[PDB]
Amino acid sequence: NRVFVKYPDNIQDYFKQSFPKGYSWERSLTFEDGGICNARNDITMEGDTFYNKVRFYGTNFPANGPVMQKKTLKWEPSTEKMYVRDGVLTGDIEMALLLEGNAHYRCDFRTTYKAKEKGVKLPGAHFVDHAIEILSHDKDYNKVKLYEHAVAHS
Amino acid sequence: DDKDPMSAIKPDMRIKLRMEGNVNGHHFVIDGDGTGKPYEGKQTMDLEVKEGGPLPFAFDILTTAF
């Protein structure tokens, strides 16, 4: 949820300007070994609470690969490029998962973001730096505590 | 302008979440409860698998979708 970004005063904040009605995003994750995920979130707001309706579908992950074998460690901090693509606010990023055994597993992301209200002004092209990390978890990841920090610039 | 800049987006806000889906045919439901500071660019969430656990794949592939 890109509403949780520190936007400076000289960049238009599409995400905070999308409320109270909300916005939605649609994302493709394409991994180096052919794994592919499609993810989407509908984000609304009621009072002080953001509500998220999330769907996640992944396929074509090799049985012997690091995703099905549970060999990942963390995502590396990275920078999303925000720009208008065919009239829709779009973010592209090249992300990387650290694996066991001094290796990385790369993934391209494209996300489109759509304000629910017509007439929300599209921003100029900029960047969003972020880092995401699991702070704690159960042995089988039945319970996970997650944290993210993000800042927009340029 | 005369408008409350934070009429909608407050300095401290809560988060609720439900995720449904499947990876390589393995289905799951995961709930989330969290808090964040929009103008600081920070958020934290406690996630719990409600169906399909223990997940047979890397939890990390899900985390940017919360």
From TrEMBL, chain A:
Keywords: Chromophore, Luminescence, Photoprotein. One of its GO terms (biological process) is generation of precursor metabolites and energy. The keyword Ribonucleoprotein does not apply. It comes from the Eukaryota. The keyword Metal-binding does not apply. The modification Cysteine sulfenic acid (-SOH) is found at residue 107. Belongs to the GFP family. This is Green to red photoconvertible GFP-like protein EosFP. It comes from Lobophyllia hemprichii.
Automatic annotation (TrEMBL), chain B:
One of its GO terms (biological process) is generation of precursor metabolites and energy. It comes from the Eukaryota. The keyword rRNA processing does not apply. The modification Phenylalanine amide is found at residue 66. Keywords: Chromophore, Luminescence, Photoprotein. Belongs to the GFP family. This is Green to red photoconvertible GFP-like protein EosFP. The chain holds residues 1 to 61 of 226 of the full protein.
